[PDB]
Amino acid sequence: VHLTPEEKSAVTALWGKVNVDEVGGKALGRLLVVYPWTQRFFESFGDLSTPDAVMGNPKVKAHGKKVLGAFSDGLAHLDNLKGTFATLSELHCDKLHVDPENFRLLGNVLVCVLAHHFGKEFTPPVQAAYQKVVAGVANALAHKYH
Amino acid sequence: VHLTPEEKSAVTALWGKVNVDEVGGKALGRLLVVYPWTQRFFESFGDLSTPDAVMGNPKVKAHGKKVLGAFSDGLAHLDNLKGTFATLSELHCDKLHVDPENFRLLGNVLVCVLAHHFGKEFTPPVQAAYQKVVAGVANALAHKYH
Amino acid sequence: VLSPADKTNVKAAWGKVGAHAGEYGAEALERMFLSFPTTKTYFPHFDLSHGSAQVKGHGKKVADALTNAVAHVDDMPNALSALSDLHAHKLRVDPVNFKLLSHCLLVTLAAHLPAEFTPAVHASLDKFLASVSTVLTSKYR
Amino acid sequence: VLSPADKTNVKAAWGKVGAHAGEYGAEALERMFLSFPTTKTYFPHFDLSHGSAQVKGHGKKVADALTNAVAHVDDMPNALSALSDLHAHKLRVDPVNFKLLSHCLLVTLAAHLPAEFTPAVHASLDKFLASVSTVLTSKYR
Numbered sequence: 053v054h055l056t057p058e059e060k061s062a063v064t065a066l067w068g069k070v071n072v073d074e075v076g077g078k079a080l081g082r083l084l085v086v087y088p089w090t091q092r093f094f095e096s097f098g099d100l101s102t103p104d105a106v107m108g109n110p111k112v113k114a115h116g117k118k119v120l121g122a123f124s125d126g127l128a129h130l131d132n133l134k135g136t137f138a139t140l141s142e143l144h145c146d147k148l149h150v151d152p153e154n155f156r157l158l159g160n161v162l163v164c165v166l167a168h169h170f171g172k173e174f175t176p177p178v179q180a181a182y183q184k185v186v187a188g189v190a191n192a193l194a195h196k197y198h
Numbered sequence: 199v200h201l202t203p204e205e206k207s208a209v210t211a212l213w214g215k216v217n218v219d220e221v222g223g224k225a226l227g228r229l230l231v232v233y234p235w236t237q238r239f240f241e242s243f244g245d246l247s248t249p250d251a252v253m254g255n256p257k258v259k260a261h262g263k264k265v266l267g268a269f270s271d272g273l274a275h276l277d278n279l280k281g282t283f284a285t286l287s288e289l290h291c292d293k294l295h296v297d298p299e300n301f302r303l304l305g306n307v308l309v310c311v312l313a314h315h316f317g318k319e320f321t322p323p324v325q326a327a328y329q330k331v332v333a334g335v336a337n338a339l340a341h342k343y344h
Numbered sequence: 345v346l347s348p349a350d351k352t353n354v355k356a357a358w359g360k361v362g363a364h365a366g367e368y369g370a371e372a373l374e375r376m377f378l379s380f381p382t383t384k385t386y387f388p389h390f391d392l393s394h395g396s397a398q399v400k401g402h403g404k405k406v407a408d409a410l411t412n413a414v415a416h417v418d419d420m421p422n423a424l425s426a427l428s429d430l431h432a433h434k435l436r437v438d439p440v441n442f443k444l445l446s447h448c449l450l451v452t453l454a455a456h457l458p459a460e461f462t463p464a465v466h467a468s469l470d471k472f473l474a475s476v477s478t479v480l481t482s483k484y485r
Numbered sequence: 486v487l488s489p490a491d492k493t494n495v496k497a498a499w500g501k502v503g504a505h506a507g508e509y510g511a512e513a514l515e516r517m518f519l520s521f522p523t524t525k526t527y528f529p530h531f532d533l534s535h536g537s538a539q540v541k542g543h544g545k546k547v548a549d550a551l552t553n554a555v556a557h558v559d560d561m562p563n564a565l566s567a568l569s570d571l572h573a574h575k576l577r578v579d580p581v582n583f584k585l586l587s588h589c590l591l592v593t594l595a596a597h598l599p600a601e602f603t604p605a606v607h608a609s610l611d612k613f614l615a616s617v618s619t620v621l622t623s624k625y626r
């Protein structure tokens with residue numbers, strides 16, 4: 053993915069302010085709440101019956117932390133997401149068989165979380181820069197299907 | 199895109215039987231008929247008011263011939279569709295701004311045309327091989343968006 | 345929306361399918377499993393190899409549901425309500441998967457009904473399957 | 486489907502938008518044009534730069550249509566029928582584009598309504614926009 057200097061700046065500055073122990077869980081929990089078919093892949097996580105149970109689920113929060121970790125790594129290798137994501141592409145595509153559209157969905161839910169967390173600071177140009185990043189990460193995670 | 203020998207065989211053998219002066223126009227015309235928003239990009243083609251006008255439109259038939267030509271070229275370079283398709287990706291993405299989902303749609307409509315034309319010969323395994331090809335062509339045409 | 349012409353086209357094409365309904369439902373499922381491998385995970389208790397009695401039996405169920413939708417085309421949400429709850433709530437079928445099966449059903453019909461699969465009828469069938477798919481994913485909205 | 490809880494959640498959140506309706510409609514459009522450049526081609530007679538009176542005026546129209554849908558949420562197909570014909574027949578708007586604008590509308594609401602944009606309300610709004618989008622693309626099925 054190619055971000056202009058202007059966009060790299062937008063992305064990096066916002067990211068340095070992200071609570072990395074919390075934001076991932078907020079995005080994963082919202083993905084499970086808003087697009088409930090994704091819960092199919094998380095049966096071992098326990099109670100996902102209501103939004104409160106999902107958001108307060110310890111495993112959702114821990115797993116989200118790993119997901120955010122992967123986005124952080126991608127933000128650091130925007131020029132080789134394919135390589136950065138090979139192992140994870142193999143897991144999500146070859147092993148779990150997650151349809152790649154859900155990669156786009158999780159990226160958009162993360163964008164919604166960032167907007168909710170940063171408010172006015174998440175301006176339209178900053179959002180545009182993040183859309184390029186999440187589309188980049190989604191395409192790399194789907195490499196094993198291409 | 200990686201096809202097994204078995205699939206390369208399936209694809210190449212069927213393709214050698216395709217009427218290349220006709221099949222492209224049948225796929226493009228059906229794309230315009232079945233998913234009518236695509237007509238937005240073909241205003242200069244004239245009468246597209248009914249299915250008969252679309253299918254019998256000389257320009258639809260001529261344009262489809264070019265589209266089929268591109269698929270033929272791709273079938274010949276399954277190991278560098280990105281390169282084979284660079285110029286066309288630039289046209290469809292940078293110039294016309296066609297949403298890439300329509301690339302997947304045109305590929306699936308071509309698959310429907312092949313099934314209609316070959317009947318029982320277009321077996322489930324042969325179809326699977328062609329789905330890998332059209333997904334490959336669609337991903338390459340969308341490269342300029344990635 | 346399904347127009348009067350679309351309803352006529354679908355009833356006509358489905359009419360030609362006849363005793364082959366279940367066989368075509370099974371062929372569509374097989375084409376789906378071979379073409380879009382991700383869909384196979386919904387069927388663990390099924391052997392999906394060619395000639396499988398389970399895929400054959402399930403193809404008959406899919407055909408019967410489509411036939412019910414054709415027969416009550418003006419009341420589709422009600423007719424497929426229980427099926428909608430099953431696929432969305434219990435099975436958690438990804439919405440994208442309905443587009444995949446719909447495509448395989450069109451391919452199967454195109455492969456068996458050369459005279460009937462005209463561009464106009466192809467369009468009506470696509471709209472019919474899109475409508476069925478909308479209903480089946482409605483317990484998500 | 487939109488459940489009773491979803492209708493309450495949407496009316497509540499939209500209620501907090503208040504006099505800001507049109508401004509948010511315009512911000513959503515701008516976010517859409519910047520984030521998904523392909524959508525700009527539908528607006529040739531519009532200058533889409535920030536502060537554009539046309540995008541501001543058009544944001545008010547989009548908000549008013551959403552407000553009409555909220556107000557007649559149980560009769561959405563009828564309420565948005567003319568808008569449906571316009572976007573599908575005349576404008577030929579690609580169905581994918583509704584998902585894009587819907588996403589930008591959620592982002593805009595999340596950016597302006599911190600207290601209201603809870604996971605439950607986010608889900609209701611997503612379902613509401615999905616329903617609006619289904620209606621707006623229905624003159625395709």
Ligand code: HEM
Nearest residue numbers: 090093094118119122123148150154155158159189190193
């Ligand atoms: C861009 C989006 C995504 C990213 C960056 C991502 C990242 C990750 C990471 C880092 C792990 C842990 C890997 C490890 O244990 O070494 C993981 C696991 C997992 N992910 Fe994702 N993921 C994404 C989307 C999805 C989606 C959409 C689903 C399905 C709804 C999904 C389902 C799973 C499952 C089931 C596991 C557990 C694998 C196991 O431990 O056996 N992921 N993901």
Ligand code: HEM
Nearest residue numbers: 236239240264265268269294296300301304305335336339
């Ligand atoms: C995989 C799918 C597709 C392939 C292989 C393909 C291939 C081609 C080719 C070979 C040309 C002629 C290029 C030239 O004149 O040098 C062309 C032109 C064009 N295509 Fe496509 N195309 C695809 C999909 C689409 C879709 C989905 C749309 C939009 C609905 C579209 C719209 C156009 C337009 C408007 C032109 C005319 C460009 C001009 O002459 O100014 N194409 N395409």
Ligand code: HEM
Nearest residue numbers: 383386387405406409410427431435437441442445446476
């Ligand atoms: C045109 C669309 C579809 C129709 C008409 C349809 C119809 C049906 C019917 C009639 C049943 C049997 C219900 C019963 O026993 O009461 C069923 C079951 C099922 N369907 Fe579908 N279906 C469709 C699409 C899908 C898709 C796209 C998937 C997933 C890829 C799917 C996965 C399943 C599964 C997993 C079962 C349960 C099988 C079992 O455990 O016995 N369906 N469907």
Ligand code: HEM
Nearest residue numbers: 524527528546547550551568572576578582583586587617
């Ligand atoms: C939530 C979804 C949407 C709503 C509620 C909505 C609403 C509206 C309304 C109320 C109008 C004015 C109609 C009139 O003047 O009578 C309009 C016009 C228009 N819309 Fe949308 N719209 C939506 C999505 C879209 C999308 C996704 C696109 C394309 C990317 C689009 C493109 C247009 C265009 C090109 C016009 C005409 C502008 C002009 O020529 O003046 N709309 N829309």
